[PDB]
């Protein structure tokens, strides 16, 4: 669950932050824990200083949150970060890491989506599947 | 030369063609 | 949303998952390769179409393939 | 996709042998190779003779030689049909 | 003569071109003192212009109504030196060049690291190769007939059709 | 002659420049001593 | 958002890309949601009806605007001095001097001077007054309404045709060859004999008297007797004044050849026998295929049976029948290629052999007609190759085409593209080398050192047609040749009189500049063919992208991986080949216009001396003929060319605008639009107003297309303004 | 006021000697627009001997600069602390490079 009462990193503000679509369509949240107070670069442009302990941040896009996660992973060795999706109705959807284990590591219970049982050169030509709802993969 | 009545007749035929074109466009649009 | 497919030429090197900026791919258990794992795309609604995964794939002609389709707010990379 | 229609009586005339089957000659499928060769020679002579009469063309050409000049291109198809029938056992 | 053109050695407009060039150089010559190096240079230019027009007029070149030599390239031997024989000279050189380059490529595949041979030329071996090109048609034809020039289609990479 | 200097001299740009200048010098001297060759003379 | 109702994926787009892509895919019916083949064919049939109605409405509008605002009744009386009016001007942004300067043609209101040549065409075919022009406009309005009603009717239930009707190749070929080509040509010959030739001889024929005014004094009795040569007796005299009975003949069918000595156009009796013969030949062609009565040829058997037994063509043409019948894009490519070839043929043959009275003296009209139809030809040929590439993407079945001719094209596509590249580089290297060589030797004061190759092959062809200029003395230029004695009694005097008179554009004299510009044209044709053929044959896949057929005919790229894949689709090959097509028609029209202006000025030696080097083209054609165009308006005044003087600059503007969509690419503009979205959202008194679609940058393919459109419009408008204003300033 | 400056002469090879135009003063060459003649007149150069000596000085300074480059990279390379003196560099380049240069040129 997303604790809304987590304090935010000390930032002086910028023009690069989230627009009206964040409060109207969807917004993203990233939390992480730091061992010390240290300066990081905002993914929207500018420098902010994260506090010692937990940090909660709001963004407009998932890619901005994951860019910040990659930055703090390769520059501060922080891997406990969690990314959530928040709707205007208040429903919070946990996004990353989805099952608690990072996607580059195999975890039990994961099912393959979009896997094709042949090589890419065995896809069908369009002329078989014109005027037909058969997929080009077979 | 051409008179006013002839131009009016051409305008009436063009309006008929406009109605037929609108009908064809509605038929093509399903 | 874009469509991401993983073909059975995948060797399970996990490079495409590490290259993904939008957390679209993940590694699942498999028996078709020596690494014992294959890439999968359960989250293609967040796929922007950047094809960093296709750049990262080391198998001769790519095992992971991105087909651009219907554009959404997430796929267009719109912060507005 | 949809079935491609043909007129009634269309058969498969694709060939990889020395000569095509006689069906490619249509209504002339039952004419022997000797008759084709004789008609080709006769058509060549009549077409060349009629053409040589109508090379000095005037404003009043003879209609009969004009019709007979069209046997000159006919003889080419006739000797091709003669070759086809000769290698078809006919 | 050919195509209604006239020989340059009897064309009056060819003479008009020569006279116009000579007067154009002479009016520049008029503004310099005799013995000055610009005067000698201009007189040498006049001599080259006269020698060029004289040489062109006695060569059997055909001149059009413009006053310039027109080349005939239909294969006739009476103008065989205008396109056919210089082209064969190119055909001598160019067939040389590619062949020696091809030879170097066949050498370069046999080295330990071919790409270093590609960027850093083996100068004695390259000089040997550029020496070899003087008999290139017969050597290339024997390479062709022995199956060492053309490779079969089943050993060449092709895209999916 | 140092072998490393010779190998540097054997590089593609140096040899390219030297060979193309050498060829240009052939064309220039041929046109200096035999100018205005529009044709092969008969 | 439900504007693109044919695409659910486009209709769910939240940005401005939805409107653009719905606009660009609106007529791409094959890609629509749930399109079936029968619905596809029926929509295509009705759309073809609508385009036919549009063509008829445009022609009726031309006829009406001439009958109302033209000077046709003045122009018929004095065709060689009165300037033809296209349509009237009513522009409220005009000042008074612009009103004064456009008041031409003998009328009291501002008018545009016609360049389309409709005056000469309508006058030649027998129209004389404004009344029949209006009646023709009414008839075409009625015909367009009839075709609109037919388009509606043939979509209604119990009238929608089946797929077997649409794919009936034999019936459609027989009916379109015998009736649409043959009987239409026979009826046009009938119109020429019955109406046009009597009106050319000063005797009025209309609907009120055409059943009582015989086209020939002997009537149809010589036709029914077999004494057809009576129709060849008493032709028009060389003293005949067109549109009058003075010097008129009584013949209706001749083959006199050459031109009428006054109009400088082809004899109308020759045109009537030509169209009669074309009708007879086409009806004979139109009885060839079997439809319902056993006799006739079968198309499938003809295609399958023509396999050469040596095996050099593989299986021959087996499977081409189903591939062609099932693919509308293969058919569209074949049709567009053939149409482009014949409109090129129209462009060459109509300037060389004009058929309309007094149009050979209308220099602006000839230039406009040639330029227009040649640009149409380039567009049609590019479209043919593009839609062939679409046929490879969407419709090509390899399994139905095993060892076919198409499969063998695909199996040696690399040889084809490599040899096209070789001949293109060959042509460009040596053509540019000769041009630059000539420039350098002319700049250094030695024009005698130029490389000037006489075009002896084409001069030999001209002599074979009877041109005695070059002294080749062969075929029709030989008085003892068997071809000369064969044709001496029928057509040789008129043809020899027309070909050996230097007063027309019949086989114009050619020199080294003509040689160089035809080899440049060959270079441009081969290079455009290289781009288009390479796009069509690599459309299904390449070494860089072997699964291209899974991605369709048009897509932006395959990402920066594998070295980078910019402009890899066949649509991108179309996009690159459009510039080369514009270049090729530019070179052709530059050559045509400069040669024809130098002949019309009586200064053909200027072209003969200046066309051998590029500086001659830049100075003596571009710079020299620009003077009346750039003086259409100046600080001293303005005249009637000013609009072209505007349009010229207009082209120079819009062409340049295309560059910005072709040089600058997407991400810069997308980030600027992010900044603009922030600016609008944060500005008071404007954030009360909100967009419904999110502003985004144009997509990559869309931006390529938009830059191409601005580029092409600038190309066309610049050259049209230049050619019309230059020809008007020098000659009109 | 009547002699066009020209400091480039071409060889006659393929007819390019036509580029040696009549620039006045009994001289043929390519007209130059770099303004060196006016600079040399402003500097007081009245003969071509002084221009020869200027060329020799330029060649010597080119050799000195290339030797200084070889020495100051390959033989005695300054440390990072030497380069990171902005105050000393500005003092020396303001007073010695621009200041003494302006003073000597005023002289
Ligand atoms: C565009 C087509 C075309 C082509 C391909 C040729 C080709 C040729 N012409 Mg030619 N010609 C043409 C059009 C053409 N011509 C036209 C339109 C004219 C009329 C102006 C002429 C008039 C013409 C003349 C007058 C002559 C040629 C000759 C030749 C031949 C000389 C080449 C050679 O050395 O072979 C010969 C050598 C070998 C085969 C082997 C040697 C190693 C060559 C086969 C010459 C010839 O020999 O005639 C056959 C010759 O005298 N041509
Ligand atoms: C070893 C030299 C060599 C040889 C024998 C070939 C052979 C061929 N090339 Mg190729 N090519 C080469 C070098 C070579 N290439 C290089 C260096 C380039 C880059 C500029 C190209 C670019 C190129 C293109 C773009 C095309 C060809 C084509 C062709 C084919 C037709 C001939 C042609 O158009 O030549 C023309 C050759 C050129 C325009 C480039 C030649 C560049 C120089 C002059 C050659 C290199 C000489 C080399 C430095 C000598 C060093 C050897 C020495 C150490 C001993 C043929 C298979 C064409 C084709 O597909 O036809 C079927 C074609 O379209 N080539
Ligand atoms: C592919 C095109 C092409 C062709 C066929 C030629 C052919 C020729 N050029 Mg040309 N040239 C070209 C491109 C071309 N050039 C280009 C692009 C330029 C501009 C850079 C020039 C600039 C140029 C000049 C300035 C001169 C030539 C000369 C020559 C002649 C060679 C004389 C020679 O070396 O004797 C060979 C002699 C031997 C002893 C061997 C020959 C007719 C020269 C000449 O004589 O003019 C007629 C000459 O002075 N050309
Ligand atoms: C004799 C009967 C007949 C006739 C006259 C036609 C006529 C036509 N059919 Mg057709 N059709 C027929 C029977 C017939 N059909 C049958 C039996 C079938 C079923 C098997 C079909 C199935 C069919 C389909 C499926 C389609 C047509 C279409 C068309 C139209 C083609 C577009 C057009 O106007 O081009 C006019 C063409 C010509 C006049 C001839 C070609 C002209 C060439 C280019 C040469 C002319 C050059 C000349 C010098 C120019 C001079 C003019 C200049 C002065 C301006 C045309 C009206 C198409 C269409 O548009 O549908 C509405 C279409 O999609 N037909
Ligand atoms: C490239 C052109 C071409 C070709 C090759 C053909 C070929 C053919 N067409 Mg075709 N056709 C064409 C163009 C063409 N057509 C065109 C342009 C049209 C329309 C304007 C038609 C319209 C058409 C129709 C309507 C029909 C054909 C048919 C045929 C086939 C009949 C073969 C035949 O006549 O043998 C017949 C054999 C002979 C004539 C041999 C001669 C018999 C004896 C030996 C004569 C000699 C007797 C004696 C020695 C002479 C002296 C006599 C004296 C005593 C009186 C044949 C495959 C027919 C068919 O079957 O469909 C496929 C058919 O019904 N065609
Ligand atoms: C009679 C000729 C003809 C016909 C029937 C078509 C018909 C078609 N073309 Mg084509 N085309 C033509 C001429 C023609 N074109 C020419 C002359 C060119 C060269 C300029 C092209 C270049 C071209 C390209 C590059 C493409 C098409 C495409 C299309 C398809 C969709 C058109 C669309 O959405 O535009 C709608 C346009 C508007 C509503 C604007 C008005 C459609 C089947 C497109 C397609 O979907 O094919 C895969 C495509 O990518 N064509
Ligand atoms: C004198 C001036 C001149 C100049 C500067 C050039 C310059 C050039 N020519 Mg060229 N040419 C000239 C005169 C000239 N040409 C004349 C007079 C002829 C008529 C004979 C030709 C015929 C010619 C051909 C046929 C070709 C060139 C090519 C080239 C370009 C590459 C050079 C080359 O061969 O690569 C060095 C050579 C190689 C890299 C490989 C060897 C390939 C050679 C050309 C094969 C020769 C032997 C072969 C069996 C003959 C086949 C020819 C056949 C198709 C008729 C280059 C820009 C080539 C080109 O443009 O490529 C597209 C080319 O294919 N030229
Ligand atoms: C004036 C402009 C120009 C020129 C010269 C070229 C030239 C070329 N284009 Mg091209 N192109 C252009 C504009 C131009 N393009 C534009 C605006 C477009 C639209 C985007 C295209 C689209 C296009 C496509 C789509 C294709 C080409 C192809 C080609 C090549 C073959 C055509 C040809 O004539 O070969 C002859 C080549 C030339 C005449 C080039 C000049 C050769 C020079 C003069 C040789 C001398 C070089 C010199 C010694 C270097 C010294 C410099 C050094 C001192 C620094 C050739 C390299 C095709 C190709 O690659 O075919 C193989 C191809 O597929 N182009
Ligand atoms: C790429 C694409 C993929 C698949 C689909 C696709 C549409 C097929 C394709 C697009 C393809 C392209 C567009 C194909 C279309 C291609 C081109 C335009 C074909 C041009 C043909 C010219 C013919 C052969 C004739 C000239 C006359 C000859 C017979 C004359 C000789 C003589 C005659 C009798 C009279 C006098 C002159 C002389 C010389 C004495
Ligand atoms: C065994 C069969 C032999 C050949 C039979 C067919 C031959 C051609 C028949 C043509 C049609 C019938 O022709 C019949 O009506 C024509 C039209 O009224 C007549 O033609 C007459 O009237 C025409 C109309 O004013 C005039 O243009 C003609 O000069 C005049 O001769 C024919 O004199 C008559 O014979
Ligand atoms: C300038 C530029 C823009 C900016 C263009 C903006 C977004 C569009 C401005 C057009 C305005 C909004 C309307 C123009 C109106 C037209 C004159 C007609 C349109 C209506 C007809 C189609 C009916 C891009 O978005 C772009 C994207 C990718 C590569 C290059 C570029 C690029 O160069
Ligand atoms: S630059 Fe544009 S076209 Fe090229 S690979 Fe990148 S996104 Fe694709």
């Amino acid at each position: 669950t997303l604790n809304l009462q987590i304090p935010s990193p000390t930032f002086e503000g910028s023009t690069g932050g989230w627009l009206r679509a964040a409060e109207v369509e969807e917004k993203y949240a990233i939390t992480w824990t730091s061992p010390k107070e240290q300066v990081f670069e905002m993914p929207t442009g500018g420098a902010a200083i994260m506090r010692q302990g937990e940090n909660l941040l709001y963004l407009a896009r998932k890619e901005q949150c994951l860019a910040l996660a990659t930055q703090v992973k390769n520059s501060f060795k922080i891997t406990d970060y969690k990314v959530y999706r928040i709707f205007p109705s208040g429903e919070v959807q946990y996004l990353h890491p989805k099952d608690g284990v990072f996607p580059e590591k195999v975890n039990a219970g994961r099912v393959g989506v979009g896997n094709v049982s042949h090589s890419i050169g065995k896809n069908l030509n369009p002329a078989q599947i014109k005027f037909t709802s058969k997929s080009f993969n077979g | 030369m051409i008179s006013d009545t002839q131009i009016f007749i051409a305008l009436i035929l063009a309006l008929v063609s406009l109605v037929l074109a609108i009908r064809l466009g509605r038929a093509l649009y399903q | 949303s874009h469509s991401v497919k993983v073909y059975d030429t995948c060797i399970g090197c996990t490079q495409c998952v590490r290259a993904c900026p939008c957390d679209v791919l993940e590694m699942v258990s498999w028996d078709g390769c020596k690494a014992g794992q294959i890439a999968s795309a359960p989250r293609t609604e967040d796929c922007i179409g950047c094809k960093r995964c296709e750049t990262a794939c080391p198998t001769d002609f790519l095992s992971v393939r991105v087909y651009l389709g219907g554009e959404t707010t997430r796929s267009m990379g719109l912060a507005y | 996709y949809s079935p491609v229609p043909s007129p009634e009586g269309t058969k498969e005339v694709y060939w990889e042998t020395k000569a095509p089957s006689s069906d490619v000659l249509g209504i002339g499928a039952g004419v022997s190779s000797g008759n084709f060769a004789a008609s080709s020679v006769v058509a060549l002579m009549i077409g060349g003779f009629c053409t040589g009469q109508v090379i000095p063309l005037t404003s009043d050409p003879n209609p009969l030689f004009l019709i007979g000049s069209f046997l000159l291109p006919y003889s080419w198809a006739l000797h091709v049909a003669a070759w086809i029938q000769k290698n078809n056992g006919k | 003569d050919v195509a209604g053109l006239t020989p340059c050695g009897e064309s009056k407009e060819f003479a008009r071109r020569l006279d116009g060039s000579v007067k154009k150089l002479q009016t520049r010559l008029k503004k310099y003192e005799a013995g000055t190096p610009p005067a000698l240079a201009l007189q040498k230019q006049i001599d080259k212009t006269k020698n060029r027009f004289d040489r062109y007029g006695k060569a059997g070149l055909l001149c059009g109504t413009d006053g310039l030599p027109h080349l005939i390239a239909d294969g006739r031997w009476s103008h065989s030196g205008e396109f056919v024989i210089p082209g064969l000279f190119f055909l001598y050189v160019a067939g040389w060049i590619g062949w020696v380059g091809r030879s170097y490529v066949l050498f370069a595949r046999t080295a330990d690291k071919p790409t270093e041979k590609e960027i850093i030329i083996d100068v004695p071996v390259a000089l040997s190769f550029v020496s070899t090109g003087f008999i290139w048609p017969f050597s290339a034809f024997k390479e062709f007939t022995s199956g060492n020039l053309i490779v079969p289609a089943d050993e060449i990479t092709v895209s999916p059709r | 002659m140092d072998s490393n200097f010779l190998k540097y001299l054997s590089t593609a740009p140096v040899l390219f420049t030297v060979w193309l200048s050498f060829t240009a010098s052939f064309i220039i001297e041929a046109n200096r001593f035999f100018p205005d060759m529009l044709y092969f003379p008969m | 958002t439900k504007f693109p109702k044919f695409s659910q994926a486009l209709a769910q787009d939240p940005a401005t890309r939805r409107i653009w892509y719905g606009l660009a895919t609106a007529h791409d019916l094959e890609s629509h949601d749930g399109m079936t083949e029968e619905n596809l064919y029926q929509k295509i049939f009705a759309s073809h009806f609508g385009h036919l109605a549009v063509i008829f409405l445009w022609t009726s509008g031309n006829l009406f605007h001439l009958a109302w605002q033209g000077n046709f009744e003045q122009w018929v009386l004095n065709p060689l001095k009165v300037k033809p009016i296209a349509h009237a001007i009513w522009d409220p942004h005009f000042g008074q001097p612009a009103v004064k300067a456009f008041t031409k043609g003998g009328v009291s209101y501002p008018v545009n001077i016609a360049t389309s040549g409709v005056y000469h065409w309508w006058y030649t075919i027998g129209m004389r007054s404004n009344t029949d022009l209006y009646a023709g406009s009414l008839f075409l309005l009625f015909l367009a309404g009839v075709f609109l009603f037919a388009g509606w009717l043939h979509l209604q239930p119990k009238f929608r045709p089946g797929l077997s009707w649409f794919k009936n190749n034999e019936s459609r070929l027989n009916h379109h060859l015998s009736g649409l080509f043959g009987f239409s040509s026979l009826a046009w010959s009938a119109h020429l004999i019955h109406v046009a030739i009597p009106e050319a001889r000063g005797q009025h024929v209309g609907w009120d008297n055409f059943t009582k005014v015989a086209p020939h004094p002997a009537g149809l009795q010589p036709f029914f007797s077999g004494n057809w040569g009576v129709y060849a007796a008493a032709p028009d005299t060389t003293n005949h004044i067109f549109g009058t009975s003075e010097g008129a003949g009584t013949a209706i069918l001749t083959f006199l050849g050459g031109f009428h000595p006054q109009t400088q156009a082809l004899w109308l009796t020759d045109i009537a026998h030509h169209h009669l013969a074309i009708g007879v030949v086409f009806i004979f062609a139109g009885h060839m295929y079997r439809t319902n009565w056993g006799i006739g040829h079968s198309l499938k058997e003809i295609l399958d049976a023509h396999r050469p037994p040596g095996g050099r063509l593989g299986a021959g043409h087996k499977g081409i029948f189903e591939t062609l019948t099932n693919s509308l894009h293969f058919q569209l490519g074949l049709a567009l290629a053939s149409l482009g070839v014949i409109t090129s043929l129209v462009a060459q043959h109509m300037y060389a052999l004009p058929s309309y009275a007094f149009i050979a003296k209308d220099y602006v009209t000839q230039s406009a007609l040639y330029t227009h139809h040649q640009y149409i030809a380039g567009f049609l040929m590019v479209g043919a190759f593009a839609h062939g590439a679409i046929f490879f993407v969407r419709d090509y079945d390899p399994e139905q085409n095993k060892n076919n001719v198409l499969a063998r094209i695909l199996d040696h596509k690399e040889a084809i593209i490599s040899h096209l590249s070789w001949v293109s580089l060959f042509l460009g290297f040596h053509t540019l080398g000769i041009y630059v060589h000539n420039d350098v030797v002319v700049a250094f004061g030695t024009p005698e050192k130029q490389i000037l190759v006489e075009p002896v092959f084409a001069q030999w062809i001209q002599a074979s047609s009877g041109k005695a200029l070059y002294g080749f003395d062969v075929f029709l230029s030989s008085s003892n040749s068997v071809a000369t004695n064969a044709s001496s009694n029928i057509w040789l005097p008129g043809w020899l009189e027309a070909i050996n008179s230097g007063k027309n554009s019949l086989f114009l004299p050619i020199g080294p500049g003509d040689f160089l510009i035809h080899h440049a044209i060959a270079l441009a044709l081969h290079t455009t063919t290289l781009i288009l053929v390479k796009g069509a044959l690599d459309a299904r896949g390449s070494k860089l992208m072997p699964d291209k057929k899974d991605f369709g005919y048009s897509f932006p790229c395959d990402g920066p991986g594998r070295g980078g894949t910019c402009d890899i689709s066949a649509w991108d090959a179309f996009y690159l080949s459009m510039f080369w097509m514009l270049n090729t028609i530019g070179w052709v029209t530059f050559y045509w216009h400069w040669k024809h202006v130098t002949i019309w000025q009586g200064n053909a030696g200027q072209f003969n001396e200046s066309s051998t080097y590029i500086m001659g083209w830049l100075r003596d054609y571009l710079w020299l003929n620009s003077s009346p165009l750039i003086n259409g308006y100046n600080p001293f005044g303005m005249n009637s060319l000013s609009v072209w003087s505007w349009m010229f600059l207009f082209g120079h503007l819009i062409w340049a605008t295309g560059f910005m969509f072709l040089i600058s690419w997407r991400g810069y503009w997308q980030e600027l639009i992010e900044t603009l979205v922030w600016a609008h959202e944060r500005t008071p008194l404007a954030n009360l107003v909100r967009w419904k679609d999110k502003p985004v940058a144009l997509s990559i393919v869309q931006a390529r297309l938009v830059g191409l459109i601005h580029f092409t419009a600038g190309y066309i408008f610049t050259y049209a303004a230049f050619v019309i204003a230059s020809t008007t300033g020098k000659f009109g | 006021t009547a002699v066009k400056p020209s400091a480039q002469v071409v060889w006659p090879i393929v007819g390019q000697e036509i580029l040696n135009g009549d620039v006045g003063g009994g001289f043929q060459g390519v007209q130059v627009t770099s303004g060196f003649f006016q600079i040399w007149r402003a500097s007081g150069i009245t003969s071509e001997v002084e221009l020869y000596w200027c060329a020799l000085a330029g060649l010597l300074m080119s050799g000195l600069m290339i030797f200084a480059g070889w020495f100051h990279y390959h033989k005695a390379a300054p440390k990072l602390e030497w380069f990171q003196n902005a105050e000393s560099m500005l003092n020396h380049h303001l007073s010695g490079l621009l200041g003494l240069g302006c003073l000597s040129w005023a002289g």
Side-chain angles (χ1 to χ4, degrees), chain G residues 281-526:
Chain G
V281 164
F282 267 110
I283 291 161
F284 265 94
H287 278 87
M288 179 165 174
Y289 308 113
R290 67 184 68 188
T291 65
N292 274 335
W293 293 277
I295 61 170
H297 292 263
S298 180
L299 294 174
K300 187 195 188 309
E301 314 204 307
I302 298 164
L303 282 154
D304 295 347
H306 274 94
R307 169 188 181 279
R312 277 177 200 81
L313 292 194
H317 288 87
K318 178 182 183 292
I320 291 287
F321 186 68
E322 288 86 2
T323 313
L324 171 56
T325 304
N326 281 326
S327 173
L328 292 161
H329 291 294
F330 182 76
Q331 297 162 59
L332 191 51
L334 285 173
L336 284 165
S338 304
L339 209 65
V341 166
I342 62 170
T343 178
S344 287
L345 204 62
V346 170
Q348 308 269 26
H349 287 180
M350 290 214 294
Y351 80 92
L353 299 154
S355 79
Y356 304 139
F358 308 105
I359 206 169
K361 292 294 184 182
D362 206 309
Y363 299 152
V364 186
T365 291
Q366 298 284 85
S367 313
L369 282 177
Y370 189 82
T371 305
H372 180 85
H373 276 116
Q374 286 283 11
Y375 271 107
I376 291 298
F379 268 102
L380 290 186
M381 284 303 320
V382 161
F385 278 105
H387 285 281
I390 299 157
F391 151 76
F392 277 111
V393 173
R394 290 180 175 186
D395 291 317
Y396 177 72
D397 201 347
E399 182 65 26
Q400 295 298 109
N401 290 275
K402 301 198 73 43
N403 213 23
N404 215 4
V405 286
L406 276 173
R408 286 160 85 82
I409 301 299
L410 275 188
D411 209 25
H412 82 296
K413 63 169 212 184
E414 286 96 3
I416 294 169
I417 295 162
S418 66
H419 272 75
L420 269 167
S421 161
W422 173 85
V423 68
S424 296
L425 287 162
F426 186 31
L427 280 154
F429 291 164
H430 291 78
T431 306
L432 177 70
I434 297 302
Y435 267 110
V436 171
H437 179 106
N438 290 353
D439 278 293
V440 168
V441 300
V442 165
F444 286 166
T446 69
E448 70 274 356
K449 287 171 64 205
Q450 277 185 101
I451 297 168
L452 299 194
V453 185
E454 193 81 11
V456 292
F457 303 159
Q459 285 167 356
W460 189 74
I461 289 183
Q462 290 200 1
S464 300
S465 293
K467 198 104 179 174
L469 200 73
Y470 316 114
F472 276 132
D473 189 358
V474 58
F475 294 133
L476 294 194
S477 66
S478 182
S479 66
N480 71 74
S481 182
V482 298
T484 292
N485 313 274
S487 54
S488 54
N489 305 137
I490 313 292
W491 69 73
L492 201 49
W495 175 262
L496 274 185
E497 199 289 337
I499 199 173
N500 288 302
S501 82
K503 299 291 180 68
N504 42 50
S505 312
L506 186 47
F507 277 114
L508 289 166
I510 47 173
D514 303 88
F515 169 89
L516 289 180
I517 191 50
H518 287 88
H519 274 86
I521 283 161
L523 161 64
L525 290 187
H526 270 104

Side-chain angles (χ1 to χ4, degrees), chain G residues 162-177:
Chain G
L163 281 171
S164 50
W165 181 91
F166 277 110
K167 302 180 156 179
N168 200 326
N169 297 295
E170 283 86 3
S171 197
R172 191 166 80 220
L173 266 173
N174 269 1
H175 269 85
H176 283 184
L177 278 179

Side-chain angles (χ1 to χ4, degrees), chain G residues 22-32 48 51 329 332 336 339 376 378-384 386-387 390 393-394 553-554 570-571 574-575 578 581 705:
Chain G
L23 272 165
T25 56
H27 296 165
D28 188 18
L29 317 178
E30 262 163 25
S31 80
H32 290 173
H48 288 186
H51 195 278
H329 291 294
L332 191 51
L336 284 165
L339 209 65
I376 291 298
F379 268 102
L380 290 186
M381 284 303 320
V382 161
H387 285 281
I390 299 157
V393 173
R394 290 180 175 186
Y553 171 70
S554 180
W571 190 94
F574 157 77
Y575 151 77
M578 281 279 303
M581 173 288 285
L705 179 56

Side-chain angles (χ1 to χ4, degrees), chain E residues 94 97-105 117 121-123 125-131, chain F residues 15-16 19, chain G residues 414-415 417-426 429 530:
Chain E
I97 295 164
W99 171 251
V100 310
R102 185 196 182 259
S103 312
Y104 193 78
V105 166
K117 298 293 183 182
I121 321 290
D122 215 342
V123 172
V125 180
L127 280 170
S128 309
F129 280 141
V130 306
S131 73
Chain F
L15 279 190
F16 206 52
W19 189 257
Chain G
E414 286 96 3
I417 295 162
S418 66
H419 272 75
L420 269 167
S421 161
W422 173 85
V423 68
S424 296
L425 287 162
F426 186 31
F429 291 164
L530 162 68

Side-chain angles (χ1 to χ4, degrees), chain C residues 25-49:
Chain C
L25 313 165
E26 51 185 25
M27 295 299 291
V28 304
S29 295
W30 192 52
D31 277 350
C33 78
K34 176 174 82 143
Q37 38 190 344
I38 201 175
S40 71
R43 292 181 285 278
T44 50
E45 68 265 17
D46 289 320
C47 180
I48 48 177

